[PDB]
Amino acid sequence: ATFEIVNRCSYTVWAAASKGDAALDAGGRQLNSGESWTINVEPGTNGGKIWARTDCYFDDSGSGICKTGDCGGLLRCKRFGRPPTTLAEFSLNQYGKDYIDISNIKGFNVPMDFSPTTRGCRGVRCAADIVGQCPAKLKAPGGGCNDACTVFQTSEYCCTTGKCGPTEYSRFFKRLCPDAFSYVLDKPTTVTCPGSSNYRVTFCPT
């Protein structure tokens, strides 16, 4: 499948794409304001994620640090990024269907639209100013709004027992972005698309 990743933000972001144990395509790239990056994702990929990283510094070897979404200090991510990270999530060619969603389960750093470029399904978006409205205890110094599991590490926020309910903190994310996952057992906002669709991820869509 083809993913076009577009940075419509006024600031530079460093895009990342991984399935947890391996990079997707090159795994990461700098995107200046307005730049687009097209990647190819193998059919059948399960558990892929795309996210943005902010305020990164890398040397010529591709090693460095980012203030949000850092993936072990690499430009080309092999692993998932450190919260807070707005997440575009996808599983492709799962019994004939693609499944896509946006998640705030690992916090929020950059607004995002995740839409198909082929026919047969709708897109999803979380573009509210979650960082500006972020509750005081969830504000990340480096930027962004952490999820409550990352901050407090309780069984209820992290849903460790498989049983958990919504919380004051999850409800904040859900109020501003109803179409993104706000906690592990949230009512699914997953979108079902035809198998082998193509997609565009836009940062700062508005």
Swiss-Prot record:
Disulphides: C9-C204, C56-C66, C71-C77, C121-C193, C126-C177, C134-C145, C149-C158, C159-C164
The organism's place on the tree of life at top rank: Eukaryota
Keywords tagged on the record: Cytoplasmic vesicle, Disulfide bond, Signal, Taste-modifying protein
Coiled-coil features, chain-numbered ranges: none
GO cellular component assignments: cytoplasmic vesicle
Pfam short name (any one): Thaumatin
Compartments it resides in: Cytoplasmic vesicle
Cited Gene3D superfamilies: Thaumatin
SUPFAM superfamilies, per the entry: Osmotin, thaumatin-like protein (SSF49870)
Predominant subcellular localization, coarse grouping: cytoplasm
PANTHER family: OS03G0233200 PROTEIN
Role of this protein: Taste-modifying protein; intensely sweet-tasting. It is 100000 times sweeter than sucrose on a molar basis.
Similarity comment: Belongs to the thaumatin family.
Protein name per UniProt: Thaumatin I
Organism: Thaumatococcus daniellii
